[PDB]
Amino acid sequence: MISKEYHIDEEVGFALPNPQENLPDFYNDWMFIAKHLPDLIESGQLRERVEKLNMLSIDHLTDHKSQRLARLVLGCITMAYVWGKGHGDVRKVLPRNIAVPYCQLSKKLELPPILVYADCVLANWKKKDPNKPLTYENMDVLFSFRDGDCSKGFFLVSLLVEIAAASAIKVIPTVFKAMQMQERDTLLKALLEIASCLEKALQVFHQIHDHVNPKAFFSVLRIYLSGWKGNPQLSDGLVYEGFWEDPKEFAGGSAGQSSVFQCFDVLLGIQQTAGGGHAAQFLQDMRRYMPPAHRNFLCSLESNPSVREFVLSKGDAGLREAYDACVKALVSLRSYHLQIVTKYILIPASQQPGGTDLMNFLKTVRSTTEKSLLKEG
Amino acid sequence: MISKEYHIDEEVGFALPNPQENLPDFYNDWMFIAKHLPDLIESGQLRERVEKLNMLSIDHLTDHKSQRLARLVLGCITMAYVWGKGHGDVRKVLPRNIAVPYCQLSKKLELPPILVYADCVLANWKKKDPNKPLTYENMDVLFSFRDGDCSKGFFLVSLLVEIAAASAIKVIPTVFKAMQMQERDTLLKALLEIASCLEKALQVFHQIHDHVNPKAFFSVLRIYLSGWKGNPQLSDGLVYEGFWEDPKEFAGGSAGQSSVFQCFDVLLGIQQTAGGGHAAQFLQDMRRYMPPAHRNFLCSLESNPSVREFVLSKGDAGLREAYDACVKALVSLRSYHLQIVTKYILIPASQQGGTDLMNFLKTVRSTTEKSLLKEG
Ligand SMILES: CCCNC(=O)C1(c2ccc(NC(=O)c3cccc(Cl)c3)cc2)CCC1
Ligand SMILES: CCCNC(=O)C1(c2ccc(NC(=O)c3cccc(Cl)c3)cc2)CCC1
């Protein structure tokens, strides 16, 4: 069993178990705006409604789940405020009434004041029926940006992959214990179980096609998830009015912020974040957009003995094959993500008057992964 | 006591205790070049002597101290080779004979193939007399670049600050044990002891003025410690011939690579690595330039519950005061480092940069000053 200091759930992994849906009544003015972003954006009243808020104190957010919900609420409001209708009419100053409590709450949780994956996927969900299991039909998201944005599909399928990967995460202690104890058969079994779980995560990933259409994702949802780091539309970043003097740059929400997007690479010694230029640096930087317990889990994995060096040394075909099943499962996931980038970004981008950087990043990550196979796939 | 897996010595902290001076006879050709850099650089013989080397296997470097000495040797040779006489005539390719074993050894130790703080400060020292204490008068460096470079003063004063901070490092287990056991008075005493040890480290820092000349530092030593990451002189990085096909960028040696430069910020919950600014980015990136045991120690500190959170939760003026004493000691250290950069970089740069380092340190100082609790 993994230690409770890492905030990894047995069932849902890095996802926030049973997220809070309602804030205390003190924050009803926040909740109305966040729950009606589609309507307020279309009516041209979103920015007016945000600007007419009073500066609410964060002190009535007493527990972690209420603080995580408030982050999700404030993050969604912030994206809507900055991006507006999503056609270039932007705002480069986040008003103090929202910016101050958002930044205070963000400092408390050690997350940047921008909507991250941990907000819009890991905390942005509920069970419809609490007695029925974690399947797509028994689940919903808490917040969307626009009507027809496919945020439900995009977020929930991401979450279901995250939950599928939780079955692999719980085997990680067995791997390190087996290595410490020199329990070859136990280690072999653990690696095969991880491979099996990552294969199941890929099958869960296939559900994306049923719940997201390309036009909607590319032209709508991708706009609202965009950040203000190296972005021509907010060249200097965003001014958080009354908290920081200078504008601050933060990257937008993405799958690179998922802890499972790199924890198995780290486990297996696939040196994604080691001296491999841009891709490495990006994966390292995205740790600062994860909850602090989850980033600490990643560096804690790095402090343990190398799984790769254990397998490489042992002259054991069964063990090398079990390691390779895990590495191949990761290759297959990268390949599927590359297919998704083609369908949902490249093709829609070509049909205009695309996401080539993301394609090249995934090709580099896949190449590093494939090259860590002990035998060719 | 701190666990042995973190490679923290009770006396010298993150410094390598009693570093090795001589390699095996197999590496005499490396040792000769490293021991004669002042003469070989000045005469224009360094680069040809490196280029004439046979590619030596790293497999005869049997222990950790031998591998660390070899890193120090190869690191110093590499800086000398890249920068030459330090007048801007640069080498863009490091030849395979040196590059391959340096990159191999670097991969084995999990450090980048460039001279880091852990090489040129933490492993680059000896006592003159083993029976006498760790003082400047009883100490020497193992390698320098040029005659008059003030490498002794710059490296050893950095080391002596590092050693002074070791007295605070050994209190860290007492801090976390006292929090776990709910031992208020033990925690208060531990925080006051850390503040005192950091105050003492500041007084040790004052010796820099006695042993380093601004002109010599700026015009010579700073040049040899420079890396090839965002450096216009090697815009694409350095080619490590026969290891990687494409050139690779790595940052140069600096105090930002010292584990004490951030472990007390981490201990006290001063979120230096949080957010997406330059300072947060830099401090996190510099953990990859620390020895793996030391980066693991920093990770372990962050995995433990927050000292800041504990002190703030208690409504205890005595405990807040002892916490603030540590924060104040850090502010003073940052302020002192700023004064050094003004004297040793900014003023010499004005008399034929430094501004990026100053802004980094001002951000770090401001973040530290904002962490003061005062009332509660
Ligand atoms: C803000 C949500 C971003 N969501 C995505 O961008 C999508 C996605 C989801 C999940 C992943 N995850 C992996 O590829 C992976 C890699 C390694 C190991 C594991 Cl377990 C998983 C990638 C993209 C959903 C459609 C594209
Ligand atoms: C390659 C050596 C680089 N050496 C320096 O650049 C100098 C130096 C030394 C030490 C420090 N250390 C701190 O400022 C500090 C901060 C927080 C906690 C502690 Cl214990 C210490 C900074 C610069 C020496 C003259 C400038």
Curated annotation (Swiss-Prot), chain B:
Catalyzes the first and rate limiting step of the catabolism of the essential amino acid tryptophan along the kynurenine pathway. Involved in the peripheral immune tolerance, contributing to maintain homeostasis by preventing autoimmunity or immunopathology that would result from uncontrolled and overreacting immune responses. Tryptophan shortage inhibits T lymphocytes division and accumulation of tryptophan catabolites induces T-cell apoptosis and differentiation of regulatory T-cells. Acts as a suppressor of anti-tumor immunity. This is Indoleamine 2,3-dioxygenase 1. Keywords: Cytoplasm, Dioxygenase, Heme, Immunity, Iron, Metal-binding, Oxidoreductase, Tryptophan catabolism. It comes from Homo sapiens. One of its GO terms (biological process) is L-tryptophan catabolic process to kynurenine. Monomer. One of its GO terms (molecular function) is indoleamine 2,3-dioxygenase activity. It catalyses: D-tryptophan + O2 = N-formyl-D-kynurenine; L-tryptophan + O2 = N-formyl-L-kynurenine. One of its GO terms (cellular component) is cytosol. The keyword Cytoplasm applies. Its EC number is 1.13.11.52. Binds 1 heme group per subunit. In the active form, the heme iron is in its ferrous state Fe(+2). The catalytic cycle does not alter the oxidation state of the heme, but IDO1 is prone to autoxidation.
